[PDB]
Amino acid sequence: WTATSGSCKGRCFELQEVGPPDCRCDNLCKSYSSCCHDFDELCLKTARGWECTKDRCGEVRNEENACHCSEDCLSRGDCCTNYQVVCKGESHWVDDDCEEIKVPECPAGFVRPPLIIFSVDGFRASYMKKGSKVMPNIEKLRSCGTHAPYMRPVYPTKTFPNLYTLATGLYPESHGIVGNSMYDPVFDASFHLRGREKFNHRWWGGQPLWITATKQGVRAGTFFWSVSIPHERRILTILQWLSLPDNERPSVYAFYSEQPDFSGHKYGPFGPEMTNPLREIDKTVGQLMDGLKQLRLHRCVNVIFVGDHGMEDVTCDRTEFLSNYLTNVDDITLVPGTLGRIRAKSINNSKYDPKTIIAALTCKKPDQHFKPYMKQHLPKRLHYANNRRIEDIHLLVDRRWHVARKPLDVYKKCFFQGDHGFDNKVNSMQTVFVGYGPTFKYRTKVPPFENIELYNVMCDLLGLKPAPNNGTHGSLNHLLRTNTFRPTMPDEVSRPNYPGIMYLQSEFDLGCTCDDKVENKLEELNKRLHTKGSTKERHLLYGRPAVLYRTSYDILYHTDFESGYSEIFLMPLWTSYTISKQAEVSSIPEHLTNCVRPDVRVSPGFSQNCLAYKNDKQMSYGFLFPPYLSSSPEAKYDAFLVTNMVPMYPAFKRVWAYFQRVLVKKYASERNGVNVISGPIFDYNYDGLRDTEDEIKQYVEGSSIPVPTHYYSIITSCLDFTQPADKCDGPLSVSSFILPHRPDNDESCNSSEDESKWVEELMKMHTARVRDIEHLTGLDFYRKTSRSYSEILTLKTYLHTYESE
Ligand SMILES: *[C@@H]1O[C@H](CO)[C@@H](O[C@@H]2O[C@H](CO)[C@@H](O[C@@H]3O[C@H](CO[C@H]4O[C@H](CO)[C@@H](O)[C@H](O[C@H]5O[C@H](CO)[C@@H](O)[C@H](O)[C@@H]5O[C@H]5O[C@H](CO)[C@@H](O)[C@H](O)[C@@H]5O)[C@@H]4O)[C@@H](O)[C@H](O[C@H]4O[C@H](CO)[C@@H](O)[C@H](O)[C@@H]4O[C@H]4O[C@H](CO)[C@@H](O)[C@H](O)[C@@H]4O)[C@@H]3O)[C@H](O)[C@H]2NC(C)=O)[C@H](O)[C@H]1NC(C)=O
Numbered sequence: 001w002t003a004t005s006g007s008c009k010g011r012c013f014e015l016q017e018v019g020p021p022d023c024r025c026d027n028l029c030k031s032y033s034s035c036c037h038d039f040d041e042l043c044l045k046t047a048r049g050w051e052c053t054k055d056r057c058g059e060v061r062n063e064e065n066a067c068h069c070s071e072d073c074l075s076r077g078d079c080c081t082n083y084q085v086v087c088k089g090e091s092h093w094v095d096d097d098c099e100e101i102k103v104p105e106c107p108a109g110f111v112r113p114p115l116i117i118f119s120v121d122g123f124r125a126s127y128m129k130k131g132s133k134v135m136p137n138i139e140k141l142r143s144c145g146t147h148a149p150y151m152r153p154v155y156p157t158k159t160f161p162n163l164y165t166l167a168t169g170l171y172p173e174s175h176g177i178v179g180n181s182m183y184d185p186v187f188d189a190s191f192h193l194r195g196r197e198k199f200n201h202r203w204w205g206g207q208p209l210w211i212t213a214t215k216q217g218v219r220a221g222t223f224f225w226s227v228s229i230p231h232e233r234r235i236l237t238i239l240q241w242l243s244l245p246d247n248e249r250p251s252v253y254a255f256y257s258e259q260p261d262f263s264g265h266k267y268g269p270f271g272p273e274m275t276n277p278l279r280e281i282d283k284t285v286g287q288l289m290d291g292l293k294q295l296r297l298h299r300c301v302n303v304i305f306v307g308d309h310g311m312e313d314v315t316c317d318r319t320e321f322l323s324n325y326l327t328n329v330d331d332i333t334l335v336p337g338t339l340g341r342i343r344a345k346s347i348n349n350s351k352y353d354p355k356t357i358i359a360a361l362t363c364k365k366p367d368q369h370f371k372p373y374m375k376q377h378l379p380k381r382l383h384y385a386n387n388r389r390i391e392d393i394h395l396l397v398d399r400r401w402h403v404a405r406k407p408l409d410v411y412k413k414c415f416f417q418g419d420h421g422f423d424n425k426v427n428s429m430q431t432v433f434v435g436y437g438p439t440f441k442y443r444t445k446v447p448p449f450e451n452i453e454l455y456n457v458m459c460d461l462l463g464l465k466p467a468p469n470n471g472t473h474g475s476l477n478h479l480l481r482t483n484t485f486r487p488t489m490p491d492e493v494s495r496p497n498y499p500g501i502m503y504l505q506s507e508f509d510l511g512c513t514c515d516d517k518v519e520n521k522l523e524e525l526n527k528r529l530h531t532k533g534s535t536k537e538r539h540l541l542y543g544r545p546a547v548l549y550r551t552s553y554d555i556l557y558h559t560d561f562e563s564g565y566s567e568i569f570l571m572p573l574w575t576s577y578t579i580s581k582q583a584e585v586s587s588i589p590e591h592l593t594n595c596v597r598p599d600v601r602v603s604p605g606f607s608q609n610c611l612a613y614k615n616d617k618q619m620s621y622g623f624l625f626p627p628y629l630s631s632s633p634e635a636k637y638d639a640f641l642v643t644n645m646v647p648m649y650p651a652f653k654r655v656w657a658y659f660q661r662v663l664v665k666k667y668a669s670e671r672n673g674v675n676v677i678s679g680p681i682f683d684y685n686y687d688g689l690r691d692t693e694d695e696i697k698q699y700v701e702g703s704s705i706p707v708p709t710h711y712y713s714i715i716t717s718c719l720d721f722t723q724p725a726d727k728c729d730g731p732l733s734v735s736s737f738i739l740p741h742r743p744d745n746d747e748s749c750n751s752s753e754d755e756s757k758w759v760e761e762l763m764k765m766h767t768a769r770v771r772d773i774e775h776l777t778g779l780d781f782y783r784k785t786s787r788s789y790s791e792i793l794t795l796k797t798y799l800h801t802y803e804s805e
Pocket residue numbers: 170171173174175176202204205206383386387388468469470687688689775
């Protein structure tokens with residue numbers, strides 16, 4: 001209920017909201033339907049427009065006017081933004097050449113530079129270049145400040161999940177806003193764009209910037225704007241708040257614009273009608289910058305210009321209909337559009353089976369414009385599984401397309417020419433970042449980065465300690481002139497054993513049948529030192545990975561590779577090796593095919609065996625260091641050690657073999673050597689975090705051998721590719737993947753063809769950051785380089801995406 005009986009006089013745009021049923025005067029009262037009767041009259045003045053003219057210069061203050069051109073206006077902080085331009089002969093901020101801001105140049109009383117976050121819905125990254133001619137203020141922010149060529153949103157590339165990611169530093173699966181539309185089965189409640197429910201606090205997890213600020217004693221402007229408050233009035237309010245005296249004036253502010261997204265949906269990303277919304281956004285930026293300049297704050301405030309996602313061409317006729325696939329279409333609920341989420345219409349239906357729905361949706365038409373997944377099988381880089389609001393069945397929709405349940409949903413709701421929501425590596429979904437102010441660098445370009453990193457940098461800009469989040473704090477240190485955050489490497493928890501020769505061959509009963517009987521003084525001091533670490537400098541280039549949890553493990557040295565062997569999981573946690581540009585590929589010789597040899601450094605108790613694989617009709621095995629790449633046929637025997645073996649489904653073996661036999665050598669030719677680190681991942685509860693031993697759901701039949709959910713590789717080389725990977729003097733280059741370990745290749749529709757037609761495409765889909773592999777393994781890489789730690793943190797967050805420029 002609301003008793004709107006009181007008055008808004010003196011309270012216009014209130015920083016501390018009051019409680020029901022007393023009437024409100026804050027920037028959100030409208031959207032709650034609760035403002036005092038006189039709110040519009042007093043707080044939403046429109047008289048005489050948004051600009052001073054010659055004649056208004058030194059008018060007598062008339063309290064009805066939208067803004068003022070009277071002598072007193074500056075100390076009152078309510079001049080029109082162009083006052084000093086029209087009435088005092090000053091220039092527009094955009095016409096001033098840029099000059100480096102080396103220190104904050106603030107009025108007395110400011111304890112820190114304020115932060116203004118100017119967010120623009122649907123602002124696609126390519127607008128910075130394609131609209132440059134019609135956005136002079138933005139262009140100046142961009143070229144004078146620090147900017148990225150683009151910024152990667154989170155999946156799904158929808159509005160609420162991204163604004164809330166920007167607020168919190170969390171993936172949607174952690175902050176809870178997993179879509180623009182949601183059902184929470186624990187609450188039995190629905191969240192919708194339209195309507196009241198979205199205001200309930202139980203939807204919104206983590207801790208957003210404004211709470212972080214409040215809890216550490218920094219005052220926050222109110223971030224949220226009711227749709228009907230015109231842009232010019234939002235800018236005026238922020239300028240007025242910045243005039244407030246020392247202990248009242250907020251230190252952080254947000255402006256939000258509904259454009260260019262509103263027009264993007266109607267006309268497409270580059271519709272001719274899109275020039276005007278771009279012009280209007282730049283004009284608003286101009287008003288803010290002229291306003292700050294009048295207040296002498298244009299060299300004091302840090303400004304961030306930032307989008308939530310881009311925009312793609314999408315039309316009614318590019319819709320796939322599940323009614324063309326499923327005979328049971330009235331038994332399901334679908335969240336439709338640029339993604340698909342499916343659940344049972346009724347949980348009392350015992351006929352609803354996910355498995356057969358997925359099967360009926362798999363590679364059914366030859367150019368199908370979506371692909372079905374169980375949520376745990378989605379690319380791990382999307383981090384989109386661990387929340388009860390995300391349905392088990394997901395559809396990833398091709399760019400430019402929609403999915404819907406039935407034709408009648410699409411004509412009884414062509415309307416739209418643009419939409420967004422697709423896979424967050426898609427080029428049309430990329431968005432913008434510019435930072436301008438004393439704390440940002442001057443005229444600097446930084447490489448593209450993910451929006452999950454910004455909350456940490458906004459906390460750095462404000463002197464706040466961030467709540468725990470998914471950013472990697474210090475990876476964006478290169479954007480900042482000062483206030484950088486200096487982290488330390490996490491401490492190693494478990495120290496490795498270094499076992500010698502401790503077991504005889506006859507202590508093992510592996511049931512393999514290896515041929516290995518072939519027998520020298522010169523070669524045996526040399527194969528000895530290879531077991532003690534002489535080529536380790538070649539194969540372990542950046543130090544051994546640190547293990548950050550409590551476990552029992554062994555370092556194993558060989559001529560061609562080094563590994564960290566887990567006695568608990570009965571396989572390597574990691575296997576490291578370097579393949580030079582000159583390396584030769586040999587084939588597997590038949591005397592050795594099903595040969596697997598005991599490793600005399602490791603007990604039969606802590607080893608795998610061949611018998612379990614022979615009994616398991618589904619499961620076969622492969623090797624982490626590839627026998628195809630061994631340096632000499634004496635070294636090739638190390639490749640067949642029981643301690644280099646891992647469980648693999650025959651369907652996965654086709655992917656792994658092609659990677660190891662064809663792709664590795666290719667990457668070495670192209671990159672001038674590569675160093676490869678490979679291993680298993682166990683994520684049975686799809687939380688993105690290393691499993692403990694008691695979370696493993698599947699073992700090789702009749703053994704203690706755990707089955708990985710995924711296999712990773714991290715492939716590193718010199719950024720300057722004229723130096724070889726093993727003698728690199730400067731910055732590094734990296735690409736990685738996390739391949740799902742699946743019993744079939746149903747994910748790849750073309751898998752009956754040769755591997756050179758589909759394997760590499762699958763790898764590209766499952767590209768990964770080093771940091772994703774770290775969360776999934778509890779390991780820390782690149783411990784020993786000659787680079788700064790901040791540069792290494794940037795390297796670890798890098799994602800190789802496989803889109804053109
Ligand atoms: C991305 O960054 C984030 C942020 O750091 C990372 O997520 C964190 O992961 C931590 C480790 O898994 C986790 O720590 C746990 O905290 C539990 C306490 O939970 C509450 O308190 C915190 C603190 O303020 C709060 O953040 C939580 O908020 C969640 O819950 C509600 C939803 O119900 C939402 O409002 C909110 O959005 C958020 O949801 C998200 O996280 C939860 C998991 O907590 C998911 O279920 C949701 O889907 C969603 O993703 C909470 O309100 C605590 O219970 C945990 O302790 C258990 O496990 C330990 C192991 O140490 C064991 O010792 C304990 O005894 C306990 O186990 C007992 O309970 C079990 C189950 O109830 C039971 O089976 C056992 O028998 C045991 O008796 C744990 O310490 C932290 O909560 C989240 N934080 C956030 C914000 O999500 C994330 O990992 C990063 N992602 C990647 C890929 O790196």
